[model samples]
Target chain A: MPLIFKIGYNVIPLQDVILPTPSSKVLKYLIQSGKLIPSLKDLITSRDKYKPIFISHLGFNQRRIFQKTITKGSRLSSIIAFSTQANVLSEVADEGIFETVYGKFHIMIESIEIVEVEKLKEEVEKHMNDNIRVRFVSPTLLSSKVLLPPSLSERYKKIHAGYSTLPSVGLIVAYAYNVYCNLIGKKEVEVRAFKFGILSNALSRIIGYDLHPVTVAIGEDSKGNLRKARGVMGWIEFDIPDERLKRRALNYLLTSSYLGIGRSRGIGFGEIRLEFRKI
Target chain B: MPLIFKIGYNVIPLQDVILPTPSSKVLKYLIQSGKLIPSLKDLITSRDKYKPIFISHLGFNQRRIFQKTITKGSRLSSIIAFSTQANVLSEVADEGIFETVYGKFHIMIESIEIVEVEKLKEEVEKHMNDNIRVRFVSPTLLSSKVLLPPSLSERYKKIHAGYSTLPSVGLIVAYAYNVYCNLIGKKEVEVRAFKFGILSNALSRIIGYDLHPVTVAIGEDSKGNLRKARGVMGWIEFDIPDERLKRRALNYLLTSSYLGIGRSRGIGFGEIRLEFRKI
Candidate 1:
């Protein structure tokens, strides 16, 4: 069975600077600082087809600041990271420390949970229903090249930005499928079975949606200028009458919790929480 | 000269019922009741290529209730109407009384202004600037058939409703240009000169936009049932660099104030305000 790890850290800031949502730059800083136990860094920074990791922004007292910033303060905050590799999880449990322009902070592993994907999938299959709500906890970017509705017009297609700020079931399921296969080292047979085109054809309509555009300061460019990306943060509820398709969709949504959805998963952009209701 | 008339009325209520935005149905009711001056009804109800009439919902104490309703009131209110025909204006100036499900009301003409399109066009031409803001005072509906951005996707086209909720400079200008021509009884030469395709080509981009969807109760069906429509109400500031195109855009925006823009305008769904500022 493929394993997924949820690791939470209690961070102490030695000094303070303005901090927004932790970007990929923060992950790069942590890896280069050599704070993580030796080989764990290489595994994460590996040039694999899919990188099995996700980093969340700092949080404390139940509030997670992603779209906004926190100024200088002696504050108790937390960060979370996810990975499917047991080797990386074992080293991460050693408690890493990293430096930032804000200050140097020590990462104390507070909580860790290991999820077996096979067991989760089995449980999800038993409770397959026609309704599912996908709430994006972090900003999500769905690239237009791969995710645009198949029937979109040429005129609209040309004017759309490189990426879509809206949620797409096709994109979400495809990302989940790719990440699941990468983590478990699956063969091509299963991939062909769950193609994006076939998956979307079976899925029905969006019952309701509430979404809005959000802009985030990702990092600096070669000239050290700020780079910003526009994404969306909201939820969408879907209705699928086909129980088989619903089961597949539920499985993908469940998998997405361990491995975030859409692009920028490495930098914590597409984290989603799935909610299933009995009614 | 093509002239446009704006007539305002101070009204007194005799009974009370829940009243939302005054729709074209209200105008229909007024004509059927025979309260309007003789022959004025046919001019508006005439089977012309374009109908020149716009009606607004009841307003009291400076608050115009379009999206919401007021109930059980012994209150004073007002109504406003617009038309480009002089015959209709002369009869409307005579102060006609009307009745509604809520109660009977007396129409006391409070304010009336006749705007000459020729003079307004000349004045607008002098103030052609790169920036202009179009604000939808009442709910506005832009039909998808003609107003959609030229570059919209075929997929999006199929999924979109019969109309668009968002504002479009192309739609606004084309509507204004049409209304202006209809009012002036323009020849074919002007129609060819200012085509929708030609106008949108010169209009560069939308500099800033703030829009949201709104649902309005337009009228009742044959069974006296509620018929509703979804539209958008907000403002859009556009950037036009070419002075000639800028002048043309400004003229259309100004004319829209008199003729309104978009479908359902006969009932008062597309009223707008034009704002020009120098920075």
Candidate 2:
């Protein structure tokens, strides 16, 4: 039943004014360095059917942390790693330090846990009812180029749409389902278009939101130019009317909490936390 | 044609850590104090069919100024006031200071000018063409409860909806027209339902955006508690395909640049600046 390994790390910066948090991109590079485990590097580099690894940006303590630069003597930051492959976790479990474009980071293993999706499903069902609140802790990059319902049309003519920074309920549901299927290596089947319409129509209003768009330094291009992504950061609350669809959404959202969702997810773009109301 | 007075003031806080920039609300209270001009106080407090006076939040030199609290000796801040009645500007032009809930403010009248809508319309047409960029300098509050096109249906079953922080092309056009009519004292004729569809469909994509929602202290409730509003801030770029609609939209937007748009117009919300591309 255990399908994923969640690793928590406490990171301390050694230098003042380090490069932007290497985040997911740097972590990918470090693993691909083939320095720690050669076989692990090969497995990561190989074209596997599904991505087996995911990481999060270093969590800093400050208001609007994205706008502020990280300097030395800052508060201790936390970084989390989630891997479908348990062996990778075992190999890197004892690693103490990491070197990246952001200088050197002294890391200590904080906690390790095996996640059972089956158990999570049961817990979600027991706790969650009609109202759901999700806090996107990190930037969530959801695409606007989505499959429109039969009745609905595009707001504007085609012009190369990018991410939908303020995502709708339908976008959230679709992306979460995609992430869920990808993580478990399940053949992604298209959820019927009519279901999307029905679900969207039956849903209650978006109760409240305190969301904002944040631009994060995702990585560097081959030319050594920094690449950035604009994603949403903050929380949204909505109520689901249909019980069946609500259960399905909760199951998919559970995977999103650990495995993540949306574009550039492997490099830590979409990190979310679900809070159930009136439990 | 010169129907509006634009007054700029340089403000220095007499006390460090004053109340939140009273911005528009304080300006109204100060004018209503009736110490400067008694008739002006009655005019402001009266239920005039249209708002004749408008003000902007204290402008500070900082990124994401909404998130940061103001303190003493921070930096010289600027505030702008606009009024259709030129007399209001003349009355306050010689005033050197004002007091508010925040504290005593040393205000020096920096500049005063008369704005002509007819001239602005010509300037807008000469400079702006297909591409338009609008930077909402202050938080823009737009309503989400709107007329749904015949083809479009509600995304969710009826529930109380507040503001649409991330607005679409239709929402922008609709609100801009609303403000323009209210400003010029024209009978607000409904821009036919079919035209909304045509305008929205004819529009090119939202080219680029760097928008975020910010919460501002709008005023105090009757119980002396702070009242806040959530509004959108930052810039959005887009292209308009229909030349006729583009010109009409530009005309309405010009009024928004002066009279403001959406809710709390008198309290400094919905301040926008139009920037033409490839001029």
- What is the C-alpha local distance difference test score of each model? 0.59, 0.60
Q: What level of docking quality does candidate 1 show?
A: incorrect
- The TM-scores, chain A only, for the candidates as listed are 0.80, 0.81
Candidate 1 lDDT, B150-193, residue by residue in tens: 34334344443344454335546766766666667774423343
Query: Best candidate, lDDT-wise?
Result: 2
Q: In model 2, what is the error at residue A155, expressed in angstroms?
A: 15
TM-score between model 2 and native: 0.53
TM-score, every prediction: 0.58, 0.53
Report the Cα lDDT for residue B122, model 2.
Answer: 82
User: By DockQ, who's the top model here?
Assistant: 2
- List runs of model 2 lying over 4 Å from the truth: A13-17, A34-52, A61-76, A83-90, A95-105, A147-158, A186-204, B1-279
DockQ values for all predictions? Answer: 0.05, 0.06
